[PDB]
Amino acid sequence: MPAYACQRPTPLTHHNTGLSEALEILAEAAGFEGSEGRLLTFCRAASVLKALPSPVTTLSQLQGLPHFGEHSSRVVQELLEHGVCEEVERVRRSERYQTMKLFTQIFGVGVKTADRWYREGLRTLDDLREQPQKLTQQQKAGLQHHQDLSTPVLRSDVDALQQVVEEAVGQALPGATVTLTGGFRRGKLQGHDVDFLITHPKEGQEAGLLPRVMCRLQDQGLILYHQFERSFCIFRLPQPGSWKAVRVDLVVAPVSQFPFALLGWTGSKLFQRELRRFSRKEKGLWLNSHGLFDPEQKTFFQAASEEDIFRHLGLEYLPPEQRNA
DNA sequence: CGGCATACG
DNA sequence: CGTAT
DNA sequence: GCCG
Ligand SMILES: [Mn+2]
Ligand SMILES: [Mn+2]
Ligand SMILES: [Mn+2]
Ligand SMILES: [Mn+2]
Ligand SMILES: [Mn+2]
Ligand SMILES: [Mn+2]
Ligand SMILES: [Mn+2]
Ligand code: NA
Known part of the structure; x- marks a missing residue:
């Protein structure tokens, strides 16, 4: 082992x-x-x-x-x-565990905020709703949509979202591609959100892309919330006779960095932390979602595929379905 | 004992 | 401070 | 909390 x-x-x-x-x-x-x-x-x-x-x-x-x-x-x-x-x-x-879990599961609330609220005596979501002046816009959105966001996203939902994201991406930049990443790429049948990676085969053409995608999604009425190369959104996902809010992450990378961004955004979180730790401590190379850097030669490894990256690191290749650390 | 992944919004 | 894998 |  x-x-x-x-x-x-x-x-x-x-x-x-x-x-x-x-x-x-x-x-x-x-x-x-x-x-x-x-x-x-x-x-x-x-x-x-x-x-x-x-x-x-x-x-x-x-x-x-x-x-x-x-x-x-x-x-x-x-x-x-x-x-x-x-x-x-x-x-x-x-009480501490249950409340910290409840608070930190709000989009816009981290451990540090949850802990402060806990020390102030706050315990429930209605406690937070009573004094909205203390909340960020991000937290107000997380709290308003909290019930929907606690509902698992289904793989059936994912296909629908991918279609609408591709439609907007195709108008923002013809030729640009959308790749499903995150937990669904590792084979999960349900998830807390949907993660997409966007690129274009001509290096440099992806510059400026995400604002153009977001403006087109917002014009189709699909964006309930959004705040560049990473966009953390809440989508309006049509449902039988209604709809529900779904968290969607949109990420753009140039094609030269795509293998590294795909690897990073496919996870798992523990897998990527361990992979970066292994890279640095065992191989002396610095890994992130943009590249892999040799600090001795002061050079970046060129990768055309995830397979390239595993090979660079002297690791046997693992498909996404086996990265569920 | 020091380290514990590494980014962007 | 939050967010992401 | 555990590893090297
Ligand atoms: Mn995800
Ligand atoms: Mn996500
Ligand atoms: Mn970047
Ligand atoms: Mn110590
Ligand atoms: Mn996650
Ligand atoms: Mn113990
Ligand atoms: Mn016993
Ligand atoms: Na949170």
């Missing part, structure tokens, strides 16, 4: 769902308390279990697995023996 998640296939569905979900509760709770290191360890331990070929049934099966020490092993031990982990259940039931 390799130590980095980018060194191992991780499928979307696996054989240790309950164990990984418990560890991810502790990771989330660590994040609400600002402990990014503990969050990462719990996330990595969770992902190791997702990568195993069969269920963990006995504690000895953890011996030698990376990222399982005293704490994560005890969590698993309790789940194996009693079906529940007291720490995990204590977190689940806590």
Whole structure:
């Protein structure tokens, strides 16, 4: 079992769902308390279990697995023996965890804002609605649309959105292309939002594209909210006899950077963090969604494909469906 | 012990 | 500060 | 919280 998640296939569905979900509760709770290191360890331990070929049934099966020490092993031990982990259940039931989860799941509210509101005594969405003068426009939109945005987006919804985005992109710049990324590209059947990557085969023609796309979407009446190369929108998605608000992310990259942007925006989040960590710490190369930089030669790697990037890093290629770390 | 990914709006 | 994978 |  390799130590980095980018060194191992991780499928979307696996054989240790309950164990990984418990560890991810502790990771989330660590994040609400600002402990990014503990969050990462719990996330990595969770992902190791997702990568195993069969269920963990006995504690000895953890011996030698990376990222399982005293704490994560005890969590698993309790789940194996009693079906529940007291720490995990204590977190689940806590007022702090529930409220931080509720607040941070609002579009426009991060851990720092949620925590401040929590310390001020606020607990519910109606508590936030009562004093809208304290809210940003982004948070007002997140709060107004919160119910719709908590409803899973279905792959059937995605095809519809892709069609309307392509229509606007085709008018903004003939020849430009739209690629579905994010969790749906990794094979998820449901998601919290839809992620699209836009480019054009002639380097430089994509310059200025996103404002032109946004203006055309807004003119078709499809944009309930938007704030460049990244656009975090709320779309109006037609529904049977009505519609619902859906979060959509639109990203533009020049074709030279497209493989890096595709790789980054396809995720998972943990997979990309681990991949960038591996790149820097094991290979001495600096990776982001624009490129891969050798700081010794002071040069950027040219990539024509995700396969190129994996090869550059000395990693076996992983299709998106196996990047579900 | 230090590090923990790395961007853009 | 928020957002993204 | 865990690794190197
Ligand atoms: Mn502990
Ligand atoms: Mn016991
Ligand atoms: Mn997404
Ligand atoms: Mn997104
Ligand atoms: Mn850029
Ligand atoms: Mn330390
Ligand atoms: Mn996400
Ligand atoms: Na949020």
